[PDB]
């Protein structure tokens, strides 16, 4: 059968030529140990080749075991981790990265992101990212929760421009403007809480649309995101839902459905606002 021929490899090309799978597995709060480890294994076995974690999630080690246990070579897997706010700063970042890489038990990370912008320590933190990139400890470097002015500020103080901006994005917060800005700068967008953190999986508007294709609201959201040119990383600790989220390279939303979903925007965040969130800074 070959796990190879079945893998969910549809990807987009980042500005530096690296291919990043448009569908990834979110790991926020999977409980370190058996839970996170088993869920991650179900994902990898289902065809996922992109995994999203973060130091702050306290489950990098579980992710590592899954990766070391699945039957797929490291080269075919895209692994992302993030630098938590408390570790910003040049030397602090290099040290944080080592801790993360050692828990993941890997020789290199595919993508490393600054978790939150904060106030005035990301530019310095970035030099460390560019250092890790130059040395090849990470194959791509990016940002997370950055508004357009945060990026403009970084672009004035960097040698290498970020390649990804991971932001909260779903039907109630489509982020069309920030997505456009990022595209202008050749920055790929990854959507977090792409299913509205589970609060949109039963939306009548989304379900109705899904009914036209024998697809669920969750699958409709993920497809809407992918067609919008964004990368999506839904999470789940349920084996059947993991497989469900991966069955989105089957159909296509019509121009009408897309306009209907884009029409749902309410500027609603389920998460914190990058402008004010200062935890651990
Ligand atoms: N950089 C950042 O600031 C940031 C912030 C938040 C999240 N993230 C990342 O992005 C990921 C996604 O964010 P998130 O986990 O908050 O939100 P999400 O992925 O939208 O969460 C979806 C919720 O819906 C349920 N679900 C998943 N698939 C489903 C399906 N097919 N049908 C019905 N319910 C389904 C899940 O429950 P079950 O587990 O029971 O399936 C889960 O609780 C995270 O895991 C994390 O890696 C990054």
UniProtKB/Swiss-Prot annotation:
Coiled coil: none annotated. It is found in: Cytoplasm. One of its GO terms (biological process) is D-arabinose catabolic process. The keyword Nucleus does not apply. It catalyses: prostaglandin F2alpha + NADP(+) = prostaglandin H2 + NADPH + H(+). The record marks 82 as: Lowers pKa of active site Tyr. Keywords: Cytoplasm, Fatty acid biosynthesis, Fatty acid metabolism, Lipid biosynthesis, Lipid metabolism, NADP, Nucleotide-binding, Oxidoreductase, Prostaglandin biosynthesis, Prostaglandin metabolism. Its EC number is 1.1.1.-. Disulfide bonds: none annotated. Catalyzes the NADP-dependent formation of prostaglandin F2-alpha from prostaglandin H2. Also has aldo/ketoreductase activity towards the synthetic substrates 9,10-phenanthrenequinone and p-nitrobenzaldehyde. Belongs to the aldo/keto reductase family. Monomer. This is 9,11-endoperoxide prostaglandin H2 reductase. It comes from Trypanosoma brucei brucei. The lineage of its organism: Eukaryota, Discoba, Euglenozoa, Kinetoplastea, Metakinetoplastina.
